[PDB]
Paper text:
Siah1 (seven-in-absentia homologue 1) is an E3 ligase belonging to the RING (really interesting new gene) domain family. It acts as a scaffolding protein and interacts with a variety of different substrates for ubiquitination and subsequent degradation. Siah1 functions in Ras, DNA-damage and hypoxia signalling pathways, and is implicated in various cancers. The SBD forms a dimerization interface with its counterpart from the partner subunit to create a Z-shaped structure.
Two isomorphous crystal structures of Siah1 were determined at 1.95 and 1.58 Å resolution. There are two molecules per asymmetric unit, labelled chains A and B, and they form a dimer consistent both with the observation that a single species of approximate mass 39 kDa was noted during size-exclusion chromatography purification and with published structures of Siah1. The electron-density map was very well defined in the 1.58 Å resolution structure, apart from one loop region (Tyr199–Gly201 in chain A and Lys198–Tyr199 in chain B), and these residues were excluded from the model. A Ramachandran plot shows that 97.4% of the residues in the high-resolution structure are located in the most favoured region, with no outliers. The degree of NCS is more highly conserved in the high-resolution structure, in which the superposition of chain A on chain B (171 Cα positions) results in an r.m.s.d. of 1.36 Å. Superposition of the two new structures on each other gives r.m.s.d. values of 0.80 and 4.89 Å for chains A (175 Cα atoms) and B (164 Cα atoms), respectively. The high value again occurs owing to a difference in the position of the N-terminal zinc-finger subdomain in the two structures. The result is that the Zn2+ ions are displaced by about 14.5 Å when the structures are superposed. The overall molecular packing in each lattice remains well conserved and it is simply that there is space that allows the N-­terminal zinc finger of the B chain to adopt a position where it can either interact with a molecule at 1 − x + ½, y + ½, −z + ½ as in the highest resolution structure or interact with a molecule at 1 − x, 1 − y, z as in the case of the lower resolution structure. The notable conformational flexibility of the N-terminal zinc-finger subdomain may contribute to its role in the biological function by adapting its position to assist in interactions with distinct substrate proteins.
Numbering used by the authors:
A (entry chain A): 91 to 198, 202 to 282
B (entry chain B): 91 to 197, 200 to 282
Write the structure that this text describes.
């Protein structure tokens, strides 16, 4: 009688629908049951939810994250020299989306990694570029790349140095009064 | 009137001026006998000479250093994945001056590259210039901009202080092609 149907790959998240194979990828791309992990670095939070639930999750459970508005902002990371492994996290709203800016300090001497991810898909992220600048007297260091999508996350890119990477000596060249300004410009491409 | 005279600090390099102590500093700041070390990295050439002897030295003794003439050039450093300590050097001619571009690969579980530009000239001359180093890859760009160091300052202190373009062997793979790394060097007047 009927042909063989496939479960949606998000059946374990509650997705009841079964589909012919040709329709399966189309459906999973749009499935509201698709789970996303909390994108706030790094280990604490075990929340999972839908893509449209991520920004509300951040607003309700991570109140220390600020959200600036605009495509060209300044990310002031304060107290870059106070001891340990440390994270700074900020959201940036522009182009109808929210981008998360992360600066992570790792101990090795210390080094810093700065990266941007979009609360959105890879196909959406590929329409943007982000630029991180450090500005100092007669000095400028700039990184430009495509934002990571939250499904991809940022840990892999940081492991690969595929982001702005700089040491304590660099941070000191650019810091003022113990704080480091990072200019962040999101553009369409 | 009566006076105790002192030799210029560059007497050993040929300066025969002797002067009262109060005017010694004023002379030495403009004295043409001031020696400069060979600016070519890292440690093997011991030559020293006056500023006007530096370009003839590089041309006589360091013939494998290539020069490109232009304000906006591509420095192609070949074989960037060679292990250990490695230097690449070339000269860029523009605005009436010569600039030395250096890429240094150093080796703690961290090989890192340092790229920096020095003017064959004085600090005062270098202050009129800016340089931009850009690495370009697929949907990626890493840029450093700064004032070139003068050859009297050298580049060792800047490299020690990461006051230059600094990148590891992992991020280099984003920019390398065929095992080589193109660095765009643009010099401008400010
Ligand atoms: Cl300075
Ligand atoms: Cl500018
Ligand atoms: Cl001196
Ligand atoms: Zn589904
Ligand atoms: Zn969370
Ligand atoms: Zn003299
Ligand atoms: Zn020499």
């Amino acid at each position: 009688a009927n042909s063989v149907l496939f479960p949606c790959k998000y059946a374990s998240s509650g997705c009841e629908i079964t589909l012919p194979h040709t329709e399966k990828a189309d459906h999973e791309e749009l499935c509201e049951f698709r789970p996303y992990s909390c994108p706030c670095p790094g280990a604490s939070c075990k929340w999972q939810g839908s893509l449209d639930a991520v920004m509300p999750h951040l607003m309700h459970q991570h109140k220390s994250i600020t959200t600036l508005q605009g495509e060209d902002i300044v990310f002031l990371a304060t107290d870059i020299n106070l001891p340990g492994a440390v994270d700074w996290v900020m959201m940036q709203s522009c182009f109808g989306f929210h981008f998360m800016l992360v600066l992570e300090k790792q101990e090795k001497h210390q080094q810093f990694f700065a990266i941007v991810q979009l609360i959105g898909t890879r196909k959406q992220a590929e329409n943007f570029a982000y630029r991180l600048e450090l500005n100092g007297h007669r000095r400028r260091l700039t990184w430009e790349a495509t934002p990571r999508s939250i499904h991809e996350g940022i840990a892999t890119a940081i492991m690969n140095s595929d982001c702005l990477v700089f040491d304590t000596s660099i941070a000191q060249l650019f810091a003022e009064n113990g704080n480091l300004g990072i200019n962040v410009t999101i553009s369409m491409c």
